[PDB]
Amino acid sequence: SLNPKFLNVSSLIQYIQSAYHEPLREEFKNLTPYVTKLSKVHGPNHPYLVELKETYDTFKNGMLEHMQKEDDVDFPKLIKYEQGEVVDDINTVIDDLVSDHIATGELLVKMSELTSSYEPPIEACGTWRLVYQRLKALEVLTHEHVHLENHVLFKKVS
Numbered sequence: 001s002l003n004p005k006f007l008n009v010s011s012l013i014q015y016i017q018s019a020y021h022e023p024l025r026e027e028f029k030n031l032t033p034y035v036t037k038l039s040k041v042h043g044p045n046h047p048y049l050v051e052l053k054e055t056y057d058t059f060k061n062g063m064l065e066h067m068q069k070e071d072d073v074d075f076p077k078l079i080k081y082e083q084g085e086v087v088d089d090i091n092t093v094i095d096d097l098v099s100d101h102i103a104t105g106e107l108l109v110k111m112s113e114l115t116s117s118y119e120p121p122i123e124a125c126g127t128w129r130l131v132y133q134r135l136k137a138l139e140v141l142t143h144e145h146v147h148l149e150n151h152v153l154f155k156k157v158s
């Protein structure tokens with residue numbers, strides 16, 4: 001479709017915030033209730049469900065504050081850089097946002113692993129099936145969100 005190579009850091013940052021950050025902040029606020037209900041109704045007979053509320057919660061958290069770092073601190077440094085402005089600290093700023101991505105990543109591996117690649121049992125209720133659906137979706141979206149930053153946005157500045 002549109003080759004991101006032509007997008008300058010400024011625009012690439014904008015797209016990421018309109019396509020990935022903003023839609024995700026809400027997705028959580030809308031998905032979290034369902035993930036909590038599942039660990040109360042079915043957690044007792046299915047421990048993995050209790051383990052996921054946790055993982056999901058700690059993922060949501062890591063992702064929520066890692067995204068808010070990119071908006072309150074790191075994107076400015078990135079646009080600053082594109083405008084040939086002395087920043088000096090960007091080399092490591094990228095190396096922190098890269099690690100942050102590996103962290104929030106292995107967490108997506110566990111959730112998939114716990115959910116048996118998001119494949120419900122024979123006893124999954126609608127909510128259960130719905131959660132798995134919404135969750136699997138939240139995995140690929142962020143996989144696109146992170147890939148874009150890693151292999152395009154960050155590489156531009158480099």
Ligand SMILES: [Fe+3]
Binds near residue numbers: 020
């Ligand atoms: Fe981001």
Ligand SMILES: [Fe+3]
Binds near residue numbers: 067097149
């Ligand atoms: Fe990020």
Ligand SMILES: [O]
Binds near residue numbers: 066070146
């Ligand atoms: O992110």
Ligand SMILES: [Zn+2]
Binds near residue numbers: 046121
């Ligand atoms: Zn079972």
